[model samples]
Target chain A: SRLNRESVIDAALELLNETGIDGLTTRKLAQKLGIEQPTLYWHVKNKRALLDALAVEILARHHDYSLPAAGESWQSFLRNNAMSFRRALLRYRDGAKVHLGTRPDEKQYDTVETQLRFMTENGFSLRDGLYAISAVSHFTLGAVLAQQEHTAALTDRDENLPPLLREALQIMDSDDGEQAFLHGLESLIRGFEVQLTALLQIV
Target chain B: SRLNRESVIDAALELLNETGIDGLTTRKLAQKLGIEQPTLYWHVKNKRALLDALAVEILARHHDYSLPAAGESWQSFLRNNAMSFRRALLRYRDGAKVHLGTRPDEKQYDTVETQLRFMTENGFSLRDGLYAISAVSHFTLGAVLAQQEHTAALTDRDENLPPLLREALQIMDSDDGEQAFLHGLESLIRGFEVQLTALLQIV
Candidate 1:
């Protein structure tokens, strides 16, 4: 049962937490699944393909945030969606990092189109909406990666820390990275709102 | 002067362009400098020190950015500095990637303190300003890495591309990375501004 495609992906996801992204390999993946390397390849073609699948799986598992309920302001919709996305990312170690290079599948594209439609319906041009969505995604991914890396680096050394350095750790560490992420997320959403208004007036 | 640290680093930068990050090695770096490996160590100590130095050099070269010109809004100050940072990151191959995980020297801390003063003077709490600044830096690093990796993945295959994805490319590609980055940057700056206003009102 574990050798099947779905079970294989599930195991790979668990492997992600056990071994860091860089450490996850087919040889190890095979052993984890109690299958040969060739058998694993039969289930998933290659390393890149496997990572791609895991990326897709992670997103799909967290797909619906009760998306855009009736009378939802675009801002509210974005905030909820972003909060959900970040929460989902933090569920797995290095989740945000792994998700960075993933390609969008058909199901994911539906989400993209829906978001784009949200922006356009609110009066942003196709170009503007797309840019808005892409920007938010980039910012989210970047923020998460920085946080994970920050924690990783912090564990190694503590002596000779400067006031600024110590303060940064305190700010970033507060609420387990929630405060900073929300601050950035809120600002980012507001930013697009401003841009949208200006674009609408100009258009 | 040629045997000094500056010349050694200059050659390393050139070597980075010629060979990607993975290909960069101390032996090769030493060879490029026309000095023995041990002599190269005498100049730079080790690979970690070498990279750390290069990262510092990259930022130092782009530091100041004529920060906070007369009567300039905080928005303008942030935009100019971000533009400079991004430009610097794009200079060397994987410059942004290299810049990440870098520890700042005393000179960089002076820059950090100056920027912190800007935020605090403008009404943000020390903690809020620190969080705000960190959020923006993470966002910028993530955005740049995503853009670079996005292009890298795109080259492998184009067939069977999803509609949503195809649309995203068209939007993100419209300005060859500039438009998307600016859009995100503007939104991010706006995000912090909103946070600043909210925090000031609460205080």
Candidate 2:
């Protein structure tokens, strides 16, 4: 009865991609894996543990979330870094949700280090780097979460919405609503860049 | 029979607040109202309609949304509107969750028009206004969602989470996480204002 972490994660991802967490269950995952429920437990501690492991696996995929150097301006570098993170969130079916579920402190060291490296390289002090990281973290989470809701048709039967809202829906239908996301993202990164510069000077 | 829209919405909100959408039932709501299940249909078409009504009601409560004057800069006005929207979201439980549930185009006329009025006045074309309005929408949705997740401890929780990730659990101990949201938000608005102004004037 050895724990096979990768197999459990694969099953979880299969369940997630197919049904989302709402319909995901260890029993279903076991059934999908053709294993008993207890056998499933031998592979993973519990559902929460599996979710965290899934989160870890997802973050690990972006561990090398590399980008160009700080470039000429602090804001420019910051924008690139944030965009890289956003792009990472866009990679998986439920990538952002998985990131949001990640225990920040418990995240894979490679991911956390890469994030810290981005902040410090941009001239933020250690504490400021953490804060900047938090800002980007929230902004990215918020931006991606915003995107999920935009895809409500995937989940909610949002067909008969009124006319005015229909216009918003039309906008969403375009580019999978990347315009709204890019605008806010550009702003979030811009703000972070500006503030980090100011904070750097202050420190 | 005259239907109490308020009563129906109240029940829905109560259901959502307590058990989320999964547990919300038209039958349960009707029973709570001491009315037959089919009686609920008279009040609203169905759950989607009910959610739309709820979304409108949610925005209506935040009727404090406003626009910047023609002569004033667009940044201040957009920021003001965003702040107002976030306040409204914070006023209700699962406010962002509900806000994201429905299309904003229907419920957001005054805000959209006001934004358009300001953007046009600022010499921005129709497209820029769309982007500006979108920025406002993304910002509000993003910020409120971040706050809700923060309060819900949805950010991070894991037993084997290392000390590096533990930083987040420590963050949960204080109100420090909010600053990241504000930083990202303010940064985004400032960046939008600056970038758009430059683009409009130059291009």
Candidate 3:
């Protein structure tokens, strides 16, 4: 009974992995679970709630990172965590899509405080740290989101790759977009990086 | 009869602007155009075609940029063109959504080629010039697309923006985003700018 809701959410994710966000449904989820349709309703309050649960599950998997100890460099901590989380996101089909447009319910805030703490530790006034978190998340999220799209586009492009596809791949995503992600991330961190010196210049 | 298809597309854009993309429908469109619902089928084949046509109309609005003659540097040409097209796309509702996914057909090609020639004229190799176009377009398109989304989020957040919204807006677009656009544009163009002088000197 405790994990029943989690199991229902798992079935929905499997369905999403198979057929994408467009195809997943409560009826189909129940069928996939080999349960009566109404059983799913008992486990999760409603369809939207189930989707929210799936999003929570997705965020939870990536948030395995614990915060750093008292005095370590905060910027390094965040960039590494963000990159690791990105790796986790790209593994799951449409993970970024699933996350997008869903308001951040209290569920996904597992790492929010760790993030804010690191920012404050690193000398970002609490407000600036929050801003850094927002900017870096968007940069990281946007990169992963765009990568999913371009990958979809490539798979769909038959024969010789289209020239624009070829070109976008080169600069925007060379070597599987690892470089481009760093470019955007580094630019964002630069803003935070600039403030660090004023706060306490170690380097 | 002569104007049917284009008129359908025009009304579609109007519908898009008035109600946002989710509210757009064949029936609502019929009412807007003062025609019966099925009558729309005569001019436009389907919703997919309608979306493509919306993108086409957006691009068609941008066809008039006459590339200035030889002395103009590629960066100047590219910067203005990127800004121009972004503005056109920004004009319609969900404008960025309409443009990003598909392959560029013939009309789209003409718009692309002018930039291609601009780069080639400035001495970039064909492939490299093509890569330049992709980076610039993707960055600008990605930037503007994100901008529109943030603006929408701002609308929804009229009282208090979600935590994530502030960072995305502040970093990429806070101060009108034009400067951020230019910042990134300069970064992209700077790569070429340095190479052009260096490569030309070496040659």
Candidate 4:
């Protein structure tokens, strides 16, 4: 099989789904690729480097709404972007863990630059815009991480559970947590709107 | 010196700070405590069990504002709780990662019940109250996770960085990210206020 950067990354993503972050190793990846360890190292130097590539590749492949459409409101863009980002992270096992702590790839620089500019055009300072974007990203990441990690427990009801806790768990278990995610996302977006309005009043 | 649950967890946490999550092992923890693996096993059976204990201990030791004070506003409680939770997660290396995916300890059940009752007493339904609390928790977790993970890169500057990216990085780098965290927390709380208001109208 031909070994290129793209092919190597694709194989790594497959291995990630099978083994998760902890189980992923260059040795295992090389074994899956039917290649020598040295050859695998040529494409991906180590687990950390491979994870960085996977993080970027995951978004590039699955996050469709990285940028807003023409004349899209900043609020709408944030919501859509967040949903898209969540879907991307939810696509693979431990996807959020993969994305966590990774530096933004050079490939994402232009996209993020455009996002910041979009916010400024909509009346946010570069700082506030970045904060808004980051808040959404962080919130979404945490939500998915919890969701993935707790899929088994969310449905396993214990009779010993308190009434409120039991009800809360049932509510979350009722859907794929879309209701909670939407509710929280709206609250966050509305919160951003409040900040934007206050900024407008000051100016 | 003595072999006990408390002493074992204390040593594990100290070891965690030295080695981070990936590097932490039962073998090293037993060695750190000057005990054999069999003795450590009696206290903390394995790495996973030790991590679960560490997650609970980190919060129990540092998160002071877990419940609302008498007559405190729901918003205020949420704010203080998020801040306290963030502080606790930042106390040790990989603290958020340790908490991530672990089920809430039985010790937290009573506190959580009190929190839900407080929200309902302040006009939120059990379900909505839980959502609000969970959102704050998920956001704070993500915020701290990102903060801890990016402490190193937050200072590294590249000349080739774009203008807005550089400015954004500088803003986050300026502080320990307290400003952004506070701003986002306020936004989330206010957004919940908006939801509560709409709920009141619907009822």
The candidate that wins on TM-score is 4
- Name the 10 consecutive residues with the lowest summed lDDT in model 3 chain A: A153-162
Candidate ordering by TM-score (highest first): 4, 1, 2, 3
How much lDDT does each candidate structure score?
0.73, 0.62, 0.62, 0.85
Give the distance in Å from residue A79's predicted Cα in candidate 3 to where it truly belongs.
Answer: 3.8
Judged by DockQ cut-offs, is candidate 3 incorrect, acceptable, medium or high?
incorrect
lDDT tens digits, residue span B98-146, model 2? 6663555444666655666567667766565666566666656655665
Structure candidate 4, residue pairs in collision = none
DockQ for model 2? Answer: 0.36
Residue A149, candidate 2: C-alpha displacement in angstroms: 2.7
RMSD of 3: 6.3
> Model 4: DockQ against the native?
0.59
Candidate 4 structure quality by residue, lDDT tens digits, B113-201: 78888999999988889889888988998888888777633433357788998888888778867898898998889999999988648
* Model 2 lDDT, residue A168, Cα: 45
Error of 3 at B136 (Å): 6.3
What TM-score do all the candidates reach, one by one?
0.86, 0.79, 0.67, 0.95
iRMS, all models: 2.5, 4.2, 6.4, 2.5
lDDT of 4 at B161: 83
The CAPRI classification for model 2 reads as acceptable
- Best-performing candidate as measured by lDDT: 4
Winner on DockQ between 2 and 3 is 2
Alpha-carbon lDDT of model 1:
0.73
Q: Could you tally the backbone clashes for each prediction?
A: 2, 9, 0, 0
Best by DockQ: 4
lDDT (C-alpha) at residue A126 in model 4? 87
Q: Per-residue CA lDDT of candidate 3, range B79-127, in tens? A: 7777776687678867766775555556556556566666777787766
Deviation from native of the Cα of residue B152 in model 2, angstroms:
2.8
